[PDB]
Design a protein around this ligand. Structure first.
Ligand code: UD1
Ligand code: FFQ
Length: 419
């Protein structure tokens, strides 16, 4: 059990970071490569334990996989169709294997994900999406088992609710169905756009991505090809917040402002000087007062739930109260009790956190529990007085490529410690 040991400072975090490819685009694209009959190259793939878990599932199902800068997949030989209980419990994104397997091979099993602390996370929309495409699905011994006789069939699918995951499941599966799929009330996240762009690079016909209505005209087989994953907008946001809450200046390279306009506008609302270029974003906080903002999480292009913990920290440190309402995962406030151990002030009322003022943080032992809660704990440790120990940081390594190297380059004192 790795830990982060952090020596806090009042010196601003400043300098440059180079942004990695989006975890949340890399993962679905890797599962979508289960559709592909010829070799695939996915470039700009972050080095994350979820990418490792994905590669290990891909290999288990029969694809030949290897990596470094790119990930290389030869899925021609896929010859197994189960995502085991052990693998799904380590990462629920493995649910994405169900769609391509059933659409390509007419059969697939994926363990049904268990409980998650951040809120109810059912997969009813994924199942119902596949049923509308012609799948027969049953639950048996904790397994979602899907079958179709022959090919899936294009259907008009109106999603009950906006879901990123379920959008990816029906979109990817629709690429191999006979005829046309119209997916209505689709999620508009950039990683949906990136996956659809990847499906097109491999021979699919997906249009409307980035809109509330995606059109997929199915083909018999997908080929292979090349695709460079979009930059991680949430890693981008995270470093920009690091700069803002510490009063520093940072340039995030290999990223793009169009992926996080909501976060950028709020960082300006919070008093930061945000500038952008062709593939960079900079924030300057030097000589500027941090003011609290109100935030309401919602689907893209609104402010992202994946930035909410990071902005709870910002508001906590900023002058003023700041109200954060979570409409996506109504219980994603596990970082708050940990931050309160460091002397942060906030009240939690239902799905609303009201962030107070504090004079400053004070290092303590705190525990990572989910990806973004962790990142906010690491950042707080960098700005607290004294030594913070963040335990169970394997959570962070699921979602960030060597965050401690990138923070070190911005002037942080952070050590990865083993046991
Ligand atoms: C691996 C990955 O890409 N994960 C991201 C993805 O997760 P994920 O794809 O699970 O998130 P969804 O957009 O599907 O979920 C949004 C809401 O819809 C609900 N829901 C979802 C599916 C379903 O079948 N039924 C249902 O009720 C969920 O409980 C949640 O409250 O989008 C989230 C919202 O931006 C991000 O926080 C995650 O980092
Ligand atoms: C729900 C279970 C959370 O996302 P995880 O960090 O446990 O995967």
């Amino acid at each position: 059990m790795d830990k982060f040991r952090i020596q806090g400072s009042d010196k601003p975090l400043s300098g440059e970071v180079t942004i990695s490819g989006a975890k949340n685009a890399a993962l679905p694209i890797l599962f979508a490569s289960l559709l592909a009959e010829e070799p695939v190259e996915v470039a700009n793939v972050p080095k994350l334990r979820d990418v490792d878990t994905t590669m290990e599932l891909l290999k288990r199902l029969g694809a030949e996989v290897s990596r470094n800068g790119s990930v290389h997949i030869d899925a021609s030989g896929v010859n197994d169709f189960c995502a085991p209980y052990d693998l799904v419990k380590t990462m629920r994104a493995s649910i994405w294997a169900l769609g391509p397997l059933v659409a390509r091979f007419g059969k697939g099993q994926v363990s049904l994900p268990g409980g998650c602390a951040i809120g109810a996370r059912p997969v009813d929309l994924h199942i119902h999406g596949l049923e509308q495409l012609g799948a027969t699905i049953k639950l048996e011994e904790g397994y979602v088992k899907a079958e179709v006789d022959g090919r899936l069939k294009g259907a008009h699918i109106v999603m009950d609710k906006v879901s990123v995951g379920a959008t990816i499941t029906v979109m990817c599966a629709a690429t191999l169905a006979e005829g046309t799929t119209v997916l209505e009330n689709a999620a508009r996240e950039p990683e949906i756009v990136d996956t659809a762009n990847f499906l097109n690079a491999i021979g699919a016909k997906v249009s409307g991505m980035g809109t509330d209505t995606i059109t997929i005209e199915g083909v018999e087989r997908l080929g292979g090809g090349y695709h460079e994953v979009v930059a991680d907008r949430i890693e981008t946001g995270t470093f920009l917040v690091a700069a803002a809450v510490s009063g520093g200046k940072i340039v995030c390279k290999n990223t793009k402002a169009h992926l996080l306009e909501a976060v950028l506008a709020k960082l300006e609302e919070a008093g930061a000087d945000v500038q952008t270029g062709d593939d960079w974003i900079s924030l300057d906080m030097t000589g500027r007062e941090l003011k609290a903002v109100n935030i309401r999480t919602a689907p893209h292009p609104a402010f992202p739930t994946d930035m909410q913990a990071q902005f709870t920290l910002l508001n906590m440190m900023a002058k003023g109260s700041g109200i954060i309402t979570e409409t996506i995962f109504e219980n994603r406030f596990m970082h708050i009790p940990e931050l309160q151990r460091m002397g942060a002030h906030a009240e939690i009322e239902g799905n609303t956190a009201i962030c107070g003022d504090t004079d400053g943080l004070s290092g303590a032992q705190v525990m990572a529990t989910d990806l973004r809660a962790s990142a906010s704990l690491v950042i707080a440790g960098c700005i607290a007085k004294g030594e913070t120990i963040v335990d169970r940081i394997y959570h962070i390594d699921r979602g960030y490529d060597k965050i401690e190297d990138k923070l070190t380059a911005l002037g942080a004192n952070i050590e990865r410690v083993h046991s």
